[PDB]
Amino acid sequence: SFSLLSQITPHQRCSFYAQVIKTWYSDKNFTLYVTDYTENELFFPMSPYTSSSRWRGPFGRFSIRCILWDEHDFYCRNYIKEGDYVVMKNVRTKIDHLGYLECILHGDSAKRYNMSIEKVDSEEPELNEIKSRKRLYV
DNA sequence: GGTTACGCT
Numbered sequence: 001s002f003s004l005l006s007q008i009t010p011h012q013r014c015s016f017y018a019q020v021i022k023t024w025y026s027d028k029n030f031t032l033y034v035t036d037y038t039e040n041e042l043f044f045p046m047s048p049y050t051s052s053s054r055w056r057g058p059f060g061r062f063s064i065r066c067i068l069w070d071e072h073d074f075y076c077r078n079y080i081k082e083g084d085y086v087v088m089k090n091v092r093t094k095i096d097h098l099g100y101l102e103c104i105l106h107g108d109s110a111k112r113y114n115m116s117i118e119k120v121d122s123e124e125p126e127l128n129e130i131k132s133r134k135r136l137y138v
Numbered sequence: 139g140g141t142t143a144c145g146c147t
Contacts, residue, residue, distance in 0.1 A: 044143050
């Protein structure tokens with residue numbers, strides 16, 4: 001069952017639809033910052049005053065960092081782009097040192113958890129709630 | 139495994 005990002009908590013597995021706001025690749029992992037334009041008390045409060053010029057929104061507690069390791073990394077690093085919509089399934093949540101929610105995709109060759117992330121065509125009806133909520137913060 | 143909300147690789 002899918003959760004809105006507002007509904008996810010730490011130390012569970014969850015699935016959701018989101019829009020990709022920011023990507024960062026490194027030689028250790030691939031990082032996504034995603035939002036569905038719902039607020040979560042454990043998300044970082046992105047500041048409109050000091051955040052990178054490049055981050056245009058959403059501001060406040062509206063986005064979550066996803067760390068993609070291993071195959072998830074190799075698959076998505078030159079595939080998932082800022083602006084894409086994605087569907088993430090059975091991913092892990094945790095809490096970073098500072099106490100903020102974060103989503104993790106660990107390498108899972110034995111396919112124990114059946115995790116996955118895929119692009120969702122911008123015209124899928126599943127994205128309509130995201131698009132309407134987005135209008136409120138732009 | 140990797141740190142912090144920027145970097146723009």
